[PDB]
Backbone as a ProteinNet text record, in pm:
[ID]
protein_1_A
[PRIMARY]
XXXXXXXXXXXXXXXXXXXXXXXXXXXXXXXXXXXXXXXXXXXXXXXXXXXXXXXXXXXXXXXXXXXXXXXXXXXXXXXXXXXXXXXXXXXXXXXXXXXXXXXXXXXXXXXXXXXXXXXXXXXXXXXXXXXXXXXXXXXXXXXXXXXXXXXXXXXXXXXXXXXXXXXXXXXXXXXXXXXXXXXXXXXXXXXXXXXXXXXXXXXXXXXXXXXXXXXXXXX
[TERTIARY]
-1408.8	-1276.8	-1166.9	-1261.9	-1133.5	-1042.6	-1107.3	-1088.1	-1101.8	-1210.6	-1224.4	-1119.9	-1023.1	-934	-1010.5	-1099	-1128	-1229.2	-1309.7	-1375.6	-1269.6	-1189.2	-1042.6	-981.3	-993	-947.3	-1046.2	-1151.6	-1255.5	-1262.8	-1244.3	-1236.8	-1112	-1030.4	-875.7	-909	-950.6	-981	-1023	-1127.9	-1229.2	-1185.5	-1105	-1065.3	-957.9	-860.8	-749.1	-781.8	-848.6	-965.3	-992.4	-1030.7	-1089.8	-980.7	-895.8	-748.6	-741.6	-741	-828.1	-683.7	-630.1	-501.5	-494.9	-606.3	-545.9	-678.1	-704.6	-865.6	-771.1	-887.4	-814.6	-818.4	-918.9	-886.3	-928	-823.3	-839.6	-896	-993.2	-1062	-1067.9	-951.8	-930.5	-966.1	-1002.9	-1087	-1232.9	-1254.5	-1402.8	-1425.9	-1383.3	-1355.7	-1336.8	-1312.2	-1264.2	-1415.4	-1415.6	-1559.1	-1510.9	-1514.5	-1517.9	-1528.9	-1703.4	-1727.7	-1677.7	-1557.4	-1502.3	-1338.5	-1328.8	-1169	-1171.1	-1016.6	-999.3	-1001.9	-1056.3	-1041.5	-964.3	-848.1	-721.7	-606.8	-485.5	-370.6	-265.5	-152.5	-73.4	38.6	97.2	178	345	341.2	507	507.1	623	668.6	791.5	838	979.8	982	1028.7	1097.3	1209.1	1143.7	1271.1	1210.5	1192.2	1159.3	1260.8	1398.4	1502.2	1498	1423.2	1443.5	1307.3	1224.1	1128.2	1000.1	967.9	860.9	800.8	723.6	686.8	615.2	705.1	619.4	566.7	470.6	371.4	300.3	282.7	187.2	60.8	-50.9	-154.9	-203.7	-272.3	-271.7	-368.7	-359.7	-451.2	-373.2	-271	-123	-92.1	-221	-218.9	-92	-54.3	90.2	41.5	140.6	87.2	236.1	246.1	314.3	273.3	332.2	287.2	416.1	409.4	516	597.1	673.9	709.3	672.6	627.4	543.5	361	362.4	215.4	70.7	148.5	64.7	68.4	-21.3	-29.3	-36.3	56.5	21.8	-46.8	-125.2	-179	-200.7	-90.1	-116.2	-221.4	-311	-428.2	-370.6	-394.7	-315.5	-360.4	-386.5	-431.6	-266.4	-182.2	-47.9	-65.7	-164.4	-189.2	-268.7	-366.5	-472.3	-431.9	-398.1	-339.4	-483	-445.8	-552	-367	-415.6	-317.8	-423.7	-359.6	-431.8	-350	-365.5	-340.3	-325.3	-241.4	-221.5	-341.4	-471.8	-602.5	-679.8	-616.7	-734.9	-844.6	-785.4	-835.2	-799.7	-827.8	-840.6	-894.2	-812.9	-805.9	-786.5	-769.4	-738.6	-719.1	-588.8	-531.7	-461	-370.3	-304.3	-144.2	-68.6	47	127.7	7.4	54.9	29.1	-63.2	-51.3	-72.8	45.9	96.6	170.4	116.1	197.8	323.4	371.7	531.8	511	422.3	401.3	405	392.1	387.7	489.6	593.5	699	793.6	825.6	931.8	813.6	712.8	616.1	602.1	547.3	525.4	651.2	825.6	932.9	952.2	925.8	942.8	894.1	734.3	579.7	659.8	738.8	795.1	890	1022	1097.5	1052.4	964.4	938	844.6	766	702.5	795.4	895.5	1002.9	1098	1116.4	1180.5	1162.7	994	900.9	894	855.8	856.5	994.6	1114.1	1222.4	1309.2	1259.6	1352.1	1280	1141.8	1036.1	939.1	897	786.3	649.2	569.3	437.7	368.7	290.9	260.3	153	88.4	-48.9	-49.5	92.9	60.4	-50.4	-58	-182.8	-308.5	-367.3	-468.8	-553.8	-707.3	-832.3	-880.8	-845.1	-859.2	-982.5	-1128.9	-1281.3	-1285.6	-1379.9	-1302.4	-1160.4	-1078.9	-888.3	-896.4	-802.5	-761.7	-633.6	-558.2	-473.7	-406.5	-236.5	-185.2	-183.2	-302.3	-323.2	-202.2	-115.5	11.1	54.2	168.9	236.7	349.4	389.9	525	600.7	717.9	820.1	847.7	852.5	863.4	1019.9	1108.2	1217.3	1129.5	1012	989.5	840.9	857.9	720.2	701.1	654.7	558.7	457.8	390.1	247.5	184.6	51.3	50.9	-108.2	-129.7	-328	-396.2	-420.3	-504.2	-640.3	-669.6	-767.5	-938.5	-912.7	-1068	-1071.6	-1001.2	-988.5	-920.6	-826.8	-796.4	-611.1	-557	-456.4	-386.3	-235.9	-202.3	-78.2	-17.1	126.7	209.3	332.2	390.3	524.3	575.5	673.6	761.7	910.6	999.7	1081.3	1069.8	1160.6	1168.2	991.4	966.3	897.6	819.5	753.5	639.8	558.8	467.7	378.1	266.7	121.8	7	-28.6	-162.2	-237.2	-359.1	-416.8	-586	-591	-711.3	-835.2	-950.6	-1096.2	-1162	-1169	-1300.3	-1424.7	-1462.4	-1581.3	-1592.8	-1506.8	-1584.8	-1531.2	-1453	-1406.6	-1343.8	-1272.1	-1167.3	-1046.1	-995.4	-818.5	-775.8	-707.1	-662.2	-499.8	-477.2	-340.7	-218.7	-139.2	-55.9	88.5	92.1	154.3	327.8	432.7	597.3	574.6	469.1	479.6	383.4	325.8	225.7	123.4	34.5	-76.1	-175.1	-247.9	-361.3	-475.2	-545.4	-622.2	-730	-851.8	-956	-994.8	-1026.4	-1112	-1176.8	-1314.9	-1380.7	-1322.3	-1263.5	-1254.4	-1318.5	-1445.6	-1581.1	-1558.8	-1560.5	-1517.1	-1389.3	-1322.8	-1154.3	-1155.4	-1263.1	-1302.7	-1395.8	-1467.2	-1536.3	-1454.8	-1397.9	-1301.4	-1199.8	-1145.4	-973.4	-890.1	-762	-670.4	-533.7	-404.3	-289.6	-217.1	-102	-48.3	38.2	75.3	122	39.6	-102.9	-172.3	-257.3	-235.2	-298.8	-165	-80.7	48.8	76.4	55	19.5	-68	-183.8	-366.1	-285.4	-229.6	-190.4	-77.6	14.5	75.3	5.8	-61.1	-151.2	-240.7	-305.9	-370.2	-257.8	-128.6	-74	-31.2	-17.6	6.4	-143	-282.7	-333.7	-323.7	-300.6	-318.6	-199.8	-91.4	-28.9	-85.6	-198.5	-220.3	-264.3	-362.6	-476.3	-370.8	-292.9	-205.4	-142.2	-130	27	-97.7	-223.9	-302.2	-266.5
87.4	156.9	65.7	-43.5	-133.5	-114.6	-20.9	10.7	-67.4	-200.4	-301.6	-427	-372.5	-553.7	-689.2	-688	-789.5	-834.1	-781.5	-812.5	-885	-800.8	-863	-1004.6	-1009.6	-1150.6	-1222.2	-1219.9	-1318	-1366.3	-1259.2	-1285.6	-1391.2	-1345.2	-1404.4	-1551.3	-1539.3	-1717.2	-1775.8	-1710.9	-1820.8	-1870.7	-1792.1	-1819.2	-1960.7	-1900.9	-1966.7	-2119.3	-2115	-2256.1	-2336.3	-2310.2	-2360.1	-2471.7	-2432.4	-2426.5	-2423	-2314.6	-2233.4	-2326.1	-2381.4	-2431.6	-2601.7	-2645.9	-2766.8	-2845.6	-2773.3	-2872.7	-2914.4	-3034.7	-3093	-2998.1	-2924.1	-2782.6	-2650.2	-2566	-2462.4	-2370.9	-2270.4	-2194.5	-2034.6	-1997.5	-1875.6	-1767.9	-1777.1	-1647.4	-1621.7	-1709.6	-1715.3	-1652.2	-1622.2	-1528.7	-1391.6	-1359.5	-1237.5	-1120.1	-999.2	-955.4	-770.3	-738	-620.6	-498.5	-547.5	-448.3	-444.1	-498.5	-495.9	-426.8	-395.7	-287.2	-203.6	-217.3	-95.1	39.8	160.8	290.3	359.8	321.8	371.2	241.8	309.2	199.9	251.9	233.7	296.3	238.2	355.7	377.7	349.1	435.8	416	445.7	439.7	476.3	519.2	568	632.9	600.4	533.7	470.6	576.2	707.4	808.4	814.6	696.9	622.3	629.4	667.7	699.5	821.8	962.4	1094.1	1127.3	1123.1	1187.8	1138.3	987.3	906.4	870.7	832.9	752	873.3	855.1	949.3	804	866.3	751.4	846.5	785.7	860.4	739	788	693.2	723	607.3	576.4	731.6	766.1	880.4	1063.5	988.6	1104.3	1208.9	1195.1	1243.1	1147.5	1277.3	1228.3	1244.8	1166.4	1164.3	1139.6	1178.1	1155.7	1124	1043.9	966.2	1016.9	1156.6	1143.9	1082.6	1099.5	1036	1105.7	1207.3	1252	1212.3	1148.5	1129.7	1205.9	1301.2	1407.8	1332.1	1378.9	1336.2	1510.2	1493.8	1595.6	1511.6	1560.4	1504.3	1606.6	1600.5	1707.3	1657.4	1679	1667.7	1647.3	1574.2	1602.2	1682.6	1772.9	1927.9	2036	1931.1	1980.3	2109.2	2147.7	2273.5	2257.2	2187.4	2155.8	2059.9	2096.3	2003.5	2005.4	1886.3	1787.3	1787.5	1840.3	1807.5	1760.6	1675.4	1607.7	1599.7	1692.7	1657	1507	1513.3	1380	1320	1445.1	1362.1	1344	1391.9	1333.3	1474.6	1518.9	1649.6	1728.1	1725.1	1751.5	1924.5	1978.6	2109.8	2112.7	2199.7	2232.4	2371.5	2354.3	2460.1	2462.2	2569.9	2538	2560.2	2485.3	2509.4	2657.7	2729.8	2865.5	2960.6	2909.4	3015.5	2964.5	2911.3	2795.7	2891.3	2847	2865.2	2868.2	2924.1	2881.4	2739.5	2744.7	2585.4	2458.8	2463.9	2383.5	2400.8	2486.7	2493.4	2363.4	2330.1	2243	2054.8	2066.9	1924.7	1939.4	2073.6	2117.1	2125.1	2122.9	2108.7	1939	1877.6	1724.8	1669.8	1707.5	1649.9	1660.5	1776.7	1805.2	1717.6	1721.8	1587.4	1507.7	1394.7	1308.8	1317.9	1376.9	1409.4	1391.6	1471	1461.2	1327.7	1273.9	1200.6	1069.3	1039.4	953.3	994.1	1101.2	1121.1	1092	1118.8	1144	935.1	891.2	767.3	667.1	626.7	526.3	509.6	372	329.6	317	332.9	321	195.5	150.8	20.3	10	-96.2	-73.5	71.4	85.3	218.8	206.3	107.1	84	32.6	76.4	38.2	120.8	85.6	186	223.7	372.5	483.7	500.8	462.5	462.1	588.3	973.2	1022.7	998.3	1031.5	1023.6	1012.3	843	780.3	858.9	835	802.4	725.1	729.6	597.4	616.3	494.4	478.4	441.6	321	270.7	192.7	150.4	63.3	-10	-134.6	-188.2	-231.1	-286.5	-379.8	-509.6	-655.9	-743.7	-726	-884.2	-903.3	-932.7	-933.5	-976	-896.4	-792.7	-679.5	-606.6	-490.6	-370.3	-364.4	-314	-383	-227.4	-198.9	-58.5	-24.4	30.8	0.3	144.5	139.7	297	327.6	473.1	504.8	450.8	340.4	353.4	170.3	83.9	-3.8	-105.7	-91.1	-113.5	-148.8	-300.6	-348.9	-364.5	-288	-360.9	-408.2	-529.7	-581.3	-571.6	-491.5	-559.1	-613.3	-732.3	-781.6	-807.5	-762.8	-715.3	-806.2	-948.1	-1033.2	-1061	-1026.3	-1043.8	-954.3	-837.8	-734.5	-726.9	-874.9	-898.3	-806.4	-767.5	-723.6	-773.4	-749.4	-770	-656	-583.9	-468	-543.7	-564.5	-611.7	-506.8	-507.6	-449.3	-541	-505.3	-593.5	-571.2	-424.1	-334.5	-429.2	-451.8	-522.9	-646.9	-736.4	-843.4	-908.1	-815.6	-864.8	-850.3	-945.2	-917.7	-853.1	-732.2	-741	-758.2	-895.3	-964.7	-865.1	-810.4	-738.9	-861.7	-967.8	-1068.1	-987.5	-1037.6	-1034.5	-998	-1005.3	-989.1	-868.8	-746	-641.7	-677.9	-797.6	-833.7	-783.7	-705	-676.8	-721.8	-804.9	-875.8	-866.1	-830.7	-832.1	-988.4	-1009.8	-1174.9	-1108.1	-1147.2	-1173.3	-1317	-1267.2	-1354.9	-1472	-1505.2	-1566.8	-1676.8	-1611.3	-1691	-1736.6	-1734.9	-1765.1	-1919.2	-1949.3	-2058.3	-2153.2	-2071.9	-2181.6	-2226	-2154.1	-2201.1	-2189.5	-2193.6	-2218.3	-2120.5	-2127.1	-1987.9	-2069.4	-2041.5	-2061.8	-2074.1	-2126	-2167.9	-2055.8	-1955.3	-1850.7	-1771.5	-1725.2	-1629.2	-1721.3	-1834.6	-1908.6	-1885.6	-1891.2	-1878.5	-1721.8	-1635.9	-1486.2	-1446.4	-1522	-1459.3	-1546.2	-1682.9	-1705.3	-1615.2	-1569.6	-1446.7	-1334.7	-1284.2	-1196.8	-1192.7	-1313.2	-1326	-1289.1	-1352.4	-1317.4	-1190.1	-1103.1	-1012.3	-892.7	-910	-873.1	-913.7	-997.5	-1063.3	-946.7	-915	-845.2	-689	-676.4	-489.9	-469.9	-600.7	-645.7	-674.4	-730	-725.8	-594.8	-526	-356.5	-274.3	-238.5	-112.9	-45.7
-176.1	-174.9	-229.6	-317	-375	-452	-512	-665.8	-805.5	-761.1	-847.9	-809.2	-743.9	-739.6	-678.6	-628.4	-545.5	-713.5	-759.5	-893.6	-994.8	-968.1	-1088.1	-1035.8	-897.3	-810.8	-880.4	-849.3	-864.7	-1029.3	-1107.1	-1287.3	-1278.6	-1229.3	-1249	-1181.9	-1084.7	-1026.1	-1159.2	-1148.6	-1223.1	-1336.2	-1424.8	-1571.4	-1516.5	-1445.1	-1418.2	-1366.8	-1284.3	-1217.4	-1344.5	-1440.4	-1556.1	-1615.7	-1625.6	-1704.2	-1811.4	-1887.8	-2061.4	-2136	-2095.6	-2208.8	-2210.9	-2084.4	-2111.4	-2133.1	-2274	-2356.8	-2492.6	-2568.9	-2665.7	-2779.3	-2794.6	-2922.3	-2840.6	-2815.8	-2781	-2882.6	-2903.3	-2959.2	-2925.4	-2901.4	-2820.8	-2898.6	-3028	-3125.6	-3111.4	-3025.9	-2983.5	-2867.3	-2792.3	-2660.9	-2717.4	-2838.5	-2846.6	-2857.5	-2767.7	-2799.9	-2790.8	-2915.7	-2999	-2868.2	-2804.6	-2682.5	-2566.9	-2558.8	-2439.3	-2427.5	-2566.5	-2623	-2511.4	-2430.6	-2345.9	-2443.4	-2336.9	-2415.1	-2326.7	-2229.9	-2184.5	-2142	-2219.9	-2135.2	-2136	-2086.3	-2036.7	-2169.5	-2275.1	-2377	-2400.4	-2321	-2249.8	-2106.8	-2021.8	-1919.8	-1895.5	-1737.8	-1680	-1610.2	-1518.9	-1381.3	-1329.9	-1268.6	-1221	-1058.9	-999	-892.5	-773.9	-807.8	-714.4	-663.2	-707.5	-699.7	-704.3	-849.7	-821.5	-865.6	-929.7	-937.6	-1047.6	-1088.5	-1232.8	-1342.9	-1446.9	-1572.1	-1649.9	-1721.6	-1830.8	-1929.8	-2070.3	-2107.7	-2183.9	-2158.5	-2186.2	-2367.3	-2376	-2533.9	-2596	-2546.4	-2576.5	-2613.2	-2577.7	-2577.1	-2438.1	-2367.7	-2259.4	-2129.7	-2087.5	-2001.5	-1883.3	-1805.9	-1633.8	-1563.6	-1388.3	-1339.8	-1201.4	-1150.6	-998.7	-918.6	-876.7	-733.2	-645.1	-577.3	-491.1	-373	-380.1	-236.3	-295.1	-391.1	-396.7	-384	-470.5	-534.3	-686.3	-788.9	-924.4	-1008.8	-1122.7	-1251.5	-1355.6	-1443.5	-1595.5	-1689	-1810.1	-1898.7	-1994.6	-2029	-2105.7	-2301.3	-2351.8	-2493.3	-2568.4	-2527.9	-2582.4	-2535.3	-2466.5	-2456.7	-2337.5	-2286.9	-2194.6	-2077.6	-2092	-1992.2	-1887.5	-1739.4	-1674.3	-1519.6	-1456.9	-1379.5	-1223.1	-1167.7	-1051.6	-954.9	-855.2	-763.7	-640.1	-524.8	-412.6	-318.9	-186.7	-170.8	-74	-18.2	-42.2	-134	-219.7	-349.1	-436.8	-373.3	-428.5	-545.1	-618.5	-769.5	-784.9	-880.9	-933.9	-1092.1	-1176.9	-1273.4	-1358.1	-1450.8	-1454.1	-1584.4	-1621	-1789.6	-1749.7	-1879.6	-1825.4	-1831.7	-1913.1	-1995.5	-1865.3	-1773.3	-1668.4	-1502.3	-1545.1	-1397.6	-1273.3	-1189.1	-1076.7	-1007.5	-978	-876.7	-799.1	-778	-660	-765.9	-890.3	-962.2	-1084	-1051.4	-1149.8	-1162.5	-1088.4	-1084.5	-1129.1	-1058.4	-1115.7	-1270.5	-1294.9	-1457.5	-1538.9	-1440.1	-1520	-1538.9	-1491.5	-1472	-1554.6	-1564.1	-1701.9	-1817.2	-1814.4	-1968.2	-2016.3	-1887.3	-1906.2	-1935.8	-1871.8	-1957.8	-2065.3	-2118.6	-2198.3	-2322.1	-2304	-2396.2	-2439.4	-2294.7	-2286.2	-2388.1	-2371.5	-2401.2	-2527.5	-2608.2	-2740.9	-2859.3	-2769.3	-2830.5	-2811.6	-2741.6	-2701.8	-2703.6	-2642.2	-2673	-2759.2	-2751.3	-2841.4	-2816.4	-2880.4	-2788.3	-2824.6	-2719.4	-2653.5	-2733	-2816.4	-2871.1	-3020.3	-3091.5	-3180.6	-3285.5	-3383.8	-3477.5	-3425.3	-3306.3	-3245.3	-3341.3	-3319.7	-3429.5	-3268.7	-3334.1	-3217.4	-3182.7	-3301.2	-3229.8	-3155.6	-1878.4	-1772.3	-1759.7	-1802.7	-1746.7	-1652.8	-1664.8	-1516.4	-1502.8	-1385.9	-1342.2	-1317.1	-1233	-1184.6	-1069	-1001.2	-888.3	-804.9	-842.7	-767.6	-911.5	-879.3	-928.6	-874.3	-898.5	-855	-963.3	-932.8	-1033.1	-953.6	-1041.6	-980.4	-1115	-1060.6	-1185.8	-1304.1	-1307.9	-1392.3	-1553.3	-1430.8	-1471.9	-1406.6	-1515.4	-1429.7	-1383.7	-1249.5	-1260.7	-1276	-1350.8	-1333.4	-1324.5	-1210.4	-1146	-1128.6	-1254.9	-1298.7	-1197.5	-1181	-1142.1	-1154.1	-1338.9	-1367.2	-1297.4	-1228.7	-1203.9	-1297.9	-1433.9	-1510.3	-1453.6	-1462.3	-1413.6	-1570.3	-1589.9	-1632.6	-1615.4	-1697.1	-1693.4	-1784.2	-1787.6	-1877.8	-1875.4	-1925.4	-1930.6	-1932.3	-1910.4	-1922.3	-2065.5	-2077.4	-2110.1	-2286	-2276.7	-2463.5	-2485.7	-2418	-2412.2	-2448	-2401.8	-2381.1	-2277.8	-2319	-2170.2	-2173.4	-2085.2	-2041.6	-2013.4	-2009.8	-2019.9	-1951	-1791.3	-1731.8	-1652.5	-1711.9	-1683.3	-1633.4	-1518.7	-1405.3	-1423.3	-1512.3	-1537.5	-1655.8	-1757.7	-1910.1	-1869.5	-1708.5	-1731.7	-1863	-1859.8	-1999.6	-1975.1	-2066.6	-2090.1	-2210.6	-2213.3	-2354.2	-2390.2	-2500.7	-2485.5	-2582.1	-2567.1	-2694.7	-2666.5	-2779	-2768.8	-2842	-2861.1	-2903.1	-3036.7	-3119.3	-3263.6	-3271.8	-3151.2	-3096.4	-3176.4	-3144.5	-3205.9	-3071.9	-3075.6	-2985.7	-2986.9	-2914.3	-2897	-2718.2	-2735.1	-2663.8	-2620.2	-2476.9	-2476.2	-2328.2	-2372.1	-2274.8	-2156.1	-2000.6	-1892.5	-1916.3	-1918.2	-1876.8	-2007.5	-2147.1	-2273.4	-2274.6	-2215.4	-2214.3	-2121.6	-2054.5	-1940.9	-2050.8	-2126.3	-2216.5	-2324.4	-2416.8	-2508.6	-2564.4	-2407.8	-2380.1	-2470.8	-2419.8	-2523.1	-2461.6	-2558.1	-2571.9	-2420.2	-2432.4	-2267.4	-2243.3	-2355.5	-2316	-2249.2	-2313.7	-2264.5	-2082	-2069	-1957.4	-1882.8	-1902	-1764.4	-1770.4	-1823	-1782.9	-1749.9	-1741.2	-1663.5	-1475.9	-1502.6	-1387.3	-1300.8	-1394.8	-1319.5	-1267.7	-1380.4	-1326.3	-1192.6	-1125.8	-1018.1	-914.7	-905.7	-808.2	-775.1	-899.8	-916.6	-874.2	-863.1	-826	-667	-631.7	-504.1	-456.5	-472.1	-398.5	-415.6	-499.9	-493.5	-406.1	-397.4	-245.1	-109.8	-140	2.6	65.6	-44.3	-8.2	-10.3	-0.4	8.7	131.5
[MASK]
+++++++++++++++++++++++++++++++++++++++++++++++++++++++++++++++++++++++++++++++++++++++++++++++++++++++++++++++++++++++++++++++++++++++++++++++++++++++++++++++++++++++++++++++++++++++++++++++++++++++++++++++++++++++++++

């Protein structure tokens, strides 16, 4: 019932233990492994966290919203096909073309940001090679990042300051880095301990642990 964090603790030790930045030639292109490309991450976001709770839409164009009564909507990017999820977990499905009264006002919100997100933001990862829909399990804000912990066990971060992320799989133990200049980049955890990577990407895998350490603390 972890949802993978305690796997993601243990990846995150271990790399970090190593100290991937402080060898005499770091080799951090060698860590990089093709089969381990996330195939969901979170695109843009909405912080309407005062009233009525987090919109996002994932790289896939499919949109989502996390409640503040903690129920979930997901419009499918087929723009119609929606995934609502009760606050035990109970899952239905339905279209927006022949929606309910009970879901008018959630299905008026999806749209807001839907819109919101199309018309005002950028998306996270856009020239990626496109090659089950999670959800957003929880998320927080530190001053310093978003933290955002999807359904498939998939953590990610992103940055506030240079708009730097991190995009972490406990299932492929990987990181994937989208550095200030949106260079996207895959590394196998495990290879990142054998041949070391940059002190930027080593003092953000170290943020990152603490930052898992508190998903594991607030459950």
């Amino acid at each position: 019932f972890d949802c993978h964090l305690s796997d993601m603790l243990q990846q995150l030790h271990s790399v970090n233990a190593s100290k991937p930045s402080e060898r005499g030639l770091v080799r951090q292109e060698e860590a990089e492994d093709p089969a381990c490309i996330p195939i969901f991450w979170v695109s843009k976001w909405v912080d309407y966290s005062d009233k009525y709770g987090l919109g996002y839409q994932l790289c896939d164009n499919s949109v989502g919203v996390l409640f503040n009564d903690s129920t979930r909507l997901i419009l499918y990017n087929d723009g119609d096909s929606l995934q609502y999820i009760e606050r035990d977990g109970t899952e239905s499905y339905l279209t927006v073309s022949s929606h309910p009264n009970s879901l008018m006002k959630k299905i008026t919100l999806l749209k807001y940001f839907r819109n919101y997100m199309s018309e005002h933001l950028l998306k996270a990862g856009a020239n990626i090679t496109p090659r089950r829909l999670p959800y957003l399990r929880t998320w927080f804000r530190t001053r310093s990042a978003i933290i955002l912990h999807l359904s498939n066990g998939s953590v990610q971060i992103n940055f506030f300051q240079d708009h730097t992320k991190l995009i972490l799989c406990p299932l492929m133990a990987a990181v994937t880095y989208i550095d200030e200049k949106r260079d996207f980049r895959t590394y196998r955890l495990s290879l990142l301990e054998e041949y070391g990577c940059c002190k930027e990407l080593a003092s953000r895998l170290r943020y990152a642990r603490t930052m898992v350490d508190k998903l594991l603390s607030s459950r």
